[PDB]
Amino acid sequence: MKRMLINATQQEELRVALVDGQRLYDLDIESPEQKKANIYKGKITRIEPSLEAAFVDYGAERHGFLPLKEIAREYFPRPNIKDVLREGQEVIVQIDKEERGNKGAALTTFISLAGSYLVLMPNNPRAGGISRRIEGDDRTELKEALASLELPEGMGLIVRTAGVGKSAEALQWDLSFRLKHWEAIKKAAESRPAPFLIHQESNVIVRAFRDYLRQDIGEILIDNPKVLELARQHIAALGRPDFSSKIKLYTGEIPLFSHYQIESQIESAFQREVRLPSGGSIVIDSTEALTAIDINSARDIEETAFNTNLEAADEIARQLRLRDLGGLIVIDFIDMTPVRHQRAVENRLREAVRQDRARIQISHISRFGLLEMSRQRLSHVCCTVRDNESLSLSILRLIEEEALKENTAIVPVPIASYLLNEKRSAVNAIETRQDGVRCVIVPNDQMETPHYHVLRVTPTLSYMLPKL
């Protein structure tokens, strides 16, 4: 049984976890925003032939804006807007653009329902296709897998970027949840006067249900009565009443996430090292430019390397999700001598991320044994520390260099101790060789080993210099 677990006992972190048995395989976290793509029933306040556009009271203290290019044929009893829409005439409206400075919000009757994989436009069939970002090979199957969906005649569809690695049956499951929603949309509207909200475009539960409900999900356990009932409303309004029987209140004293043992794996998304089933590990270091992943073996050399890399490919994949790693990612797989092992390790990472929602690109193992890849984002320092002694002689040589300059040290405590005792001879030797030059070595308890300043040049006291 795969379950969605939702924890909201804590006001400042709403947590959503997809869990297969007890194995965490996805996580979404939302701490304490915009009003766009929201669907309402609005009343036509006033019309203007002057702007070929009308005004719609969808419920905001400001009235929205409905151009003639957005009035659907379904609403008509080139034209003037005076011929199409009457005042007080109800209409199903979606925000096309937010409120800007003054009370301006642009609307459309041409509604769109964006799911995980598909964007249904039940209102105009003149829309549809594969996302522009998809390309030659990645998109090819799609247009085919696209054609095989069962789309009602009067509407058109778009395949999203997340649709790159999904199957025909998985796309079908999306299109249905979209249609179910659209049926709830136009029904919560036929049953009421003007105007009032239907689809909250983006509250977190709407998203979790939008993005995460696959047929394989058995239960949705929510540990908050106040939230659970909002979710029922959210499931019903989200068109799919039936999952309503499968949302169940969590009542156990042991907090939801602790009872399913996931509180620790959630913490693993922070861990730098992650153990692979066969004993090996991946190390995930992040740098300025990119994220780098190294892979060590557990404890046939060719078989071990191969099996370890394959186990890594899987773990990397799920770690890419839990961590929500964005941008450039470089993987140092354990070296493999046969080309096909490389091909086989590659194809996996390909297969392992097929279910991730983000846009992912993966290149081949370079001759150095590196796999460059990238991942679309869905949503520091302390450096070895140089010896005191080694650091001291460094500074000492740096002071001397400053003492030589024509027209001519703030160090951590034990550096100053080392310099002004163990190296007093050399410090003296500088001042005597550089006649007239004062070498002020002030210890500073506000600093430490790593750090210092050698400043080149008042009747100020040595210990009052760090402040100056």
Residues lying near Zn ion in the complex (CB under 5 A) are found at 382-383
Write down the least CB distance from residue 422 to Zn ion, Å: 26
130's CB contacts (< 8 A; 6+ apart) are 139, 142, 143, 146, 158, 159, 163
At its nearest, how many Å lie between Zn ion and the CB of residue 173? 48
φ/ψ bin of 356: left (φ > 0), alpha (ψ from -120 to 50), beta (otherwise): beta
Length of the chain: 468
CB closer to Zn ion out of 147 and 382:
382
Q: With respect to Zn ion, which residue has the nearer C-beta, 289 or 383?
A: 383
For residues 332 and 294, the answer to whether their CB atoms sit within 8 Å is yes
**Which SS3 state, helix, strand or coil, does residue 264 take?**
helix
List the beta bridge partners of residue 92: 41
| Residues preceding chain discontinuities in the chain with C to N over 2.5 Å | 32, 77, 299, 379, 382, 383, 408, 457
* 371 and 364 Cβ atoms separated by less than 8 Å: yes
Nearest to Zn ion of 361, 449 (CB atom): 449
Is 314 labeled as ligand-binding? no
CB 223 within 8 A of CB 7: yes
Cα–Cα distance for residue pair 436/404, rounded to 1 Å: 11
Nearest CB to Zn ion, comparing residues 89 and 271: 271
| Closer residue to Zn ion (CB): 301 or 382 | 382
383 belongs to an annotated ligand binding site: yes
Residue type, 212: Y
| Least Cβ distance, residue 381 to Zn ion (angstroms) | 7
CA dist., res. 288 & res. 156, Å (int): 43
Q: How far apart are the first and last CA of the chain?
A: 67
Specify the residue, 251 or 384, whose C-beta has the smaller distance to Zn ion.
384
Minimum CB–partner distance for residue 283 and Zn ion (Å)? 16
Q: By Cβ distance, which residue is nearest to Zn ion?
A: 382
Nearest distance from C-beta of residue 383 to Zn ion, angstroms: 5
Smallest gap from Cβ 448 to Zn ion, in A, equals 11
What is the DSSP track for 277-318? TTS-EEEEEE-SS-EEEEEE----HHHHHHHHHHHHHHHHHH
Report the helix count and the strand count for the chain, using DSSP H and E.
13, 23
439 labeled part of a ligand binding site: no
348 in helix, strand or coil?
Answer: helix
Give the helix/strand (H/E) hosting 417: helix 413-417
Nearer to Zn ion, 384 or 425 (CB): 384
CA distance 356 to 211: 11
Q: How far is the CB of 285 from Zn ion (least distance, A)?
A: 13
Q: Which residues are annotated as a binding site for Zn(2+)?
A: 382-383
Q: Which residues are annotated as a binding site for Mg(2+)?
A: 294, 332
Q: Which residues are annotated as a binding site?
A: 294, 332, 382-383
